[PDB]
Design an enzyme around this catalytic site. Structure first.
Site, mmCIF file in Angstrom:
data_model
loop_
_atom_site.group_PDB
_atom_site.id
_atom_site.type_symbol
_atom_site.label_atom_id
_atom_site.label_comp_id
_atom_site.label_asym_id
_atom_site.label_seq_id
_atom_site.Cartn_x
_atom_site.Cartn_y
_atom_site.Cartn_z
ATOM 1 N N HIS A 61 32.606 133.064 106.534
ATOM 2 C CA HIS A 61 31.825 132.450 105.436
ATOM 3 C C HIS A 61 30.164 132.245 105.682
ATOM 4 O O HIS A 61 29.541 132.134 105.062
ATOM 5 C CB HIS A 61 32.450 131.256 104.733
ATOM 6 C CG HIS A 61 32.760 130.160 105.902
ATOM 7 N ND1 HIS A 61 31.966 129.058 106.153
ATOM 8 C CD2 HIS A 61 34.025 129.962 106.398
ATOM 9 C CE1 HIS A 61 32.501 128.484 107.091
ATOM 10 N NE2 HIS A 61 33.592 128.845 107.430
ATOM 11 N N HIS A 91 24.748 125.593 111.118
ATOM 12 C CA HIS A 91 25.005 126.701 110.235
ATOM 13 C C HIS A 91 24.137 126.475 109.190
ATOM 14 O O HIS A 91 23.375 125.486 109.021
ATOM 15 C CB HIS A 91 26.437 126.794 109.966
ATOM 16 C CG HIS A 91 26.948 125.586 109.007
ATOM 17 N ND1 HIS A 91 27.627 124.629 109.700
ATOM 18 C CD2 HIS A 91 26.812 125.450 107.821
ATOM 19 C CE1 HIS A 91 27.677 123.845 108.721
ATOM 20 N NE2 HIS A 91 27.411 124.302 107.474
ATOM 21 N N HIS A 93 23.269 127.684 104.734
ATOM 22 C CA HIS A 93 23.547 128.451 103.736
ATOM 23 C C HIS A 93 22.410 128.980 103.116
ATOM 24 O O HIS A 93 21.507 128.379 103.125
ATOM 25 C CB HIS A 93 24.272 127.174 102.797
ATOM 26 C CG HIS A 93 25.500 126.376 103.284
ATOM 27 N ND1 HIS A 93 26.825 126.796 103.013
ATOM 28 C CD2 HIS A 93 25.139 125.440 104.115
ATOM 29 C CE1 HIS A 93 27.568 125.971 103.799
ATOM 30 N NE2 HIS A 93 26.993 125.057 104.374
ATOM 31 N N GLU A 103 22.243 124.272 99.237
ATOM 32 C CA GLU A 103 23.484 123.267 98.605
ATOM 33 C C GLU A 103 22.730 122.076 97.979
ATOM 34 O O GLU A 103 22.894 121.665 96.736
ATOM 35 C CB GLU A 103 24.268 122.933 99.791
ATOM 36 C CG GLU A 103 25.085 124.194 100.168
ATOM 37 C CD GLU A 103 26.348 124.085 100.685
ATOM 38 O OE1 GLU A 103 26.458 123.162 101.804
ATOM 39 O OE2 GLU A 103 27.336 124.713 100.417
ATOM 40 N N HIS A 116 22.591 123.048 108.261
ATOM 41 C CA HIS A 116 23.397 121.754 108.350
ATOM 42 C C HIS A 116 23.719 121.672 109.877
ATOM 43 O O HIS A 116 24.590 122.448 110.619
ATOM 44 C CB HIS A 116 24.801 122.061 107.792
ATOM 45 C CG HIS A 116 24.731 121.779 106.224
ATOM 46 N ND1 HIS A 116 25.449 122.143 105.113
ATOM 47 C CD2 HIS A 116 23.727 121.342 105.325
ATOM 48 C CE1 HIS A 116 25.019 122.070 104.083
ATOM 49 N NE2 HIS A 116 23.859 121.668 103.943
ATOM 50 N N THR A 195 30.937 120.472 102.613
ATOM 51 C CA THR A 195 30.969 121.210 101.663
ATOM 52 C C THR A 195 31.453 122.513 101.587
ATOM 53 O O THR A 195 31.300 123.229 100.553
ATOM 54 C CB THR A 195 29.335 121.784 101.308
ATOM 55 O OG1 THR A 195 28.906 122.614 102.382
ATOM 56 C CG2 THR A 195 28.442 120.491 101.587
ATOM 57 N N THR A 196 32.479 122.751 102.587
ATOM 58 C CA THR A 196 33.251 123.749 102.658
ATOM 59 C C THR A 196 34.807 123.153 102.685
ATOM 60 O O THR A 196 34.845 122.181 103.242
ATOM 61 C CB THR A 196 33.185 124.779 103.643
ATOM 62 O OG1 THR A 196 32.861 124.072 104.796
ATOM 63 C CG2 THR A 196 31.799 125.771 103.409
HETATM 64 HG HG LIG Z 1 35.625 131.690 106.355
HETATM 65 ZN ZN LIG Z 2 27.197 123.494 105.673
#
Ligand SMILES: [Hg+2]
Ligand SMILES: [Zn+2]
Ligand SMILES: [Hg+2]
EC number: 4.2.1.1
Length: 257
Positions: A61, A91, A93, A103, A116, A195-196
């Site tokens: 992801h 990581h 997004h 996000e 993040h 957020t995941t």
């Molecule tokens: Hg994943």
């Molecule tokens: Zn994140």
């Protein structure tokens, strides 16, 4: 298995992770005219000089840059935080286009990406335990706009070739996260979630006001990564962001007048 496509994206997450519709979900729109300066916040302490990065990993992801967190090497304290929180990974997004990818949003404005830096509350002993607590985590969130190259980001950009597909990792030692910070530490803060999935409601969010600029070429290289593993149909890793969620019974504070 949750993702970001039509059939497994954020609209579907609540089916496996009911907390997706919870009371302190993230990210959120930051309404600058509703957030209130909070004089009871201490200054923010970002102490990343002894940071010990280990590895970069494509997890299907996004990509995580992982850190050794068995000692107080890279830590976040001060601001809305009580105690010390250890850096575990960072990581991003990002979007398929510069007009989207962040996000959090500020007055509904989407940035091209968001970084993040995830920390866990040291009184809980490890990360797994931290995520059972309402103050287990602190995430430093930093907006990315397309502009000049960020030199401190190039090391990361340069390793992406070698972790193209799901499950690939590469050695990634002596990376200094200080090169990813903007000049100012002004921030908004609110109680939120990851957020995941599993979307645990364990996070103190600290979202910096000042975005960092990255180059078009830098962002373009993020977009060449793959969601799929090796030898599968190619799905570019792009638009791996959750849209903004209901603020509900929550207050966003500013660290600045
Ligand atoms: Hg994943
Ligand atoms: Zn994140
Ligand atoms: Hg929690």
């Amino acid at each position: 298995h949750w993702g970001y496509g039509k059939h497994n994206g954020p609209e579907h997450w609540h089916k496996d992770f009911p907390i997706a519709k919870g009371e302190r979900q993230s990210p959120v729109d930051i309404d600058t005219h509703t957030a209130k300066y909070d004089p009871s916040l201490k200054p923010l302490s970002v102490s990343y000089d002894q940071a010990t990065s280990l590895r970069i990993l494509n997890n299907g992801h996004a990509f995580n840059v992982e850190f050794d967190d068995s000692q107080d090497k890279a830590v976040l304290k001060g601001g809305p935080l009580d105690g010390t929180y250890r850096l575990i990974q960072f990581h991003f997004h990002w979007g398929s286009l510069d007009g989207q990818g962040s996000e959090h949003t500020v007055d509904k404005k989407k940035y091209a990406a968001e970084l993040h830096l995830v920390h866990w509350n040291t009184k809980y002993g490890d990360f797994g335990k931290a995520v059972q607590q309402p103050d287990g985590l602190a995430v430093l969130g930093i907006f990315l706009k397309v502009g000049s190259a960020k030199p401190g980001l190039q090391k990361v950009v340069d390793v992406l070739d070698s972790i193209k597909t799901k499950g690939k990792s590469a050695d990634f030692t002596n990376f200094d996260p200080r090169g990813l910070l903007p000049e100012s530490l002004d921030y908004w803060t609110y109680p939120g979630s990851l957020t995941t999935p599993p979307l645990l409601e364990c996070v103190t969010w600290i979202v910096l006001k000042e975005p960092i600029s990255v180059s078009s070429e830098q962002v373009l290289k993020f977009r060449k990564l793959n969601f799929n593993g090796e030898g599968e149909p190619e799905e570019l890793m792009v638009d791996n962001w959750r849209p903004a969620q209901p603020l509900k019974n929550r207050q966003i504070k500013a660290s600045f007048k």
